[PDB]
Amino acid sequence: PPNWQQLVSREVLLGLKPCEIKRQEVINELFYTERAHVRTLKVLDQVFYQRVSREGILSPSELRKIFSNLEDILQLHIGLNEQMKAVRKRNETSVIDQIGEDLLTWFSGPGEEKLKHAAATFCSNQPFALEMIKSRQKKDSRFQTFVQDAESNPLCRRLQLKDIIPTQMQRLTKYPLLLDNIAKYTEWPTEREKVKKAADHCRQILNFVNQAVKEAENKQRLEDYQRRLDTSSLVEELRNLDLTKRKMIHEGPLVWKVNRDKTIDLYTLLLEDILVLLQKQDDRLVLRCTFSPVIKLSTVLVRQVATNKALFVISMSDNGAQIYELVAQTVSEKTVWQDLICRMAASVKEQS
């Protein structure tokens, strides 16, 4: 059933406090939107994952990169939904009594660990999964066809695969507010304290998931940059350069004053241990030039320039020094560039 007061006899509702009616309504919101959530996840599963897997269009690795641990977030939310159903089945009144302890079972201890790890895996994979969907649409007619057919299913409600997948992350943003509202209409202190504790755990879970998502969006950006990387001009280190084997710390548009007469417009990447100088030539990102486009941070000294708001990046070999004059677009950003290059440069020189 959908409404709460529809369940309960009207003649037992007469006896409930107003605040107690609000409590029931908000517990019912948590239960109801969990059922809605489950239903959404069965759409991903039934319309997309199960069908495509049966058609054999995707490889084991493409499947994994698109859907990952869909199966476990599914079983998790069905189990959670079943436990919510059972809480109601405890009395024929359809009036729910105490719930703090259930919320603590669902969202702390092993319940917290299971949800946060499963959601962290599904959700942190999202940028990888959305890009793999586009790349298979772009390269494989059979999967483009499959996806277009599937999204025509009414269960999709005119929404694309790319738009349904993000339903897991959204759900996790909702738990804290749902539990705060239950707490709000909980009068008696021992019960309320439990509700609010579970609410804070839901916040902890969300923060763990969010941080994994951030880590992952940074890696998928790199993986994209690593794909577009064009070593056409290339001694051996440089042409096999793999951005993905270190984390990216910063990126932006710099300029490169090679002479007074000439200027190479760059897009530049500060990584853990190297600064990387690239050129935006249509789709590609070019690694080219005795002046290397990869500057080892282990040798770098940086200094502001008295005469634009540029910097001298100065690489030290056993010979002497090369100097890159790199000019950012504002004063504010070159202070970030300077501050971060030096942070990373002094970190590598420290680890020696």
Give one DSSP letter per residue of 298-345, joined into a string. GGEEEEE-----EEEEEEE-SS-EEEEEEE-SSHHHHHHHHHHHHHHH
**Residues near 138 by beta carbon (within 8 Å), at least 6 away in sequence:** 144
| Type of residue numbered 350 | E
Q: Rounded to whole angstroms, how far apart are CA atoms 177 and 197?
A: 13
262-280: b (≥16 Cβ within 10 Å) or e: eeeebbbbbbebbbbbbbe
Going by their DSSP bridges, the two strands 284-286 and 294-296 should be labelled as: unpaired
CA distance 152 to 316: 60
- 209 token code pair: 């998931």
CB 165 within 8 A of CB 40: no
Cα four-point dihedral sign 116, 119, 124, 125: positive
* Residue 59 one-letter amino acid: S
* CB within 8 Å of 249: residues ≥ 6 apart: 270, 271, 272, 340, 344
Contacts of 132 (CB under 8 A, 6+ apart): 62, 65, 66
Which residue type does 346 have? Answer: A
Specify whether the CB–CB gap between 195 and 186 falls below 8 A. yes
User: What resolution in angstrom units was achieved for this structure?
Assistant: 2.1
| 3-state SS class at 187 | coil
Determine the Cα–Cα distance for residues 81 and 30; give it in Å rounded to an integer. Answer: 10
All domains of the chain in start order, with CATH? 1-231 (1.20.900.10), 232-352 (2.30.29.30)
| CA distances for 102 relative to 28, 99, 114, 168, 198, angstroms | 14, 5, 15, 22, 9
Structure tokens at 314: 């100065």
What Cα–Cα distance (Å) separates residue 109 from each residue in 16, 40, 210? 33, 26, 19
Q: Of 246, 238, 308, 337, give the one whose Cα is nearest residue 278.
A: 238
The one-character DSSP state at 98 is -
Provide the 10 A C-beta neighbour count for residue 83: 14
Q: How many residues does the chain have?
A: 352
The tokens describing 42, both together, are 């069965």
Per DSSP, the residues of 241-310 read: --GGGS-EEEEEEEEEESSSS-EEEEEEEEESSEEEEEEEETTEEE------SEEEGGGEEEEE-----E
Checking 102-111 for CB contacts under 8 A at 24+ apart, the result is 103/179, 103/182, 103/194, 103/195, 103/198, 104/194, 104/197, 104/198, 104/201, 106/80, 106/198, 107/175, 107/179, 107/198, 107/201, 107/202, 107/205, 108/197, 108/198, 108/201
Tokens 């107003």, residue located: 18
Q: How far apart are CA 308 and CA 325, in angstroms?
A: 10
**Residue 129: how many CB atoms within 10 A of its CB?**
22
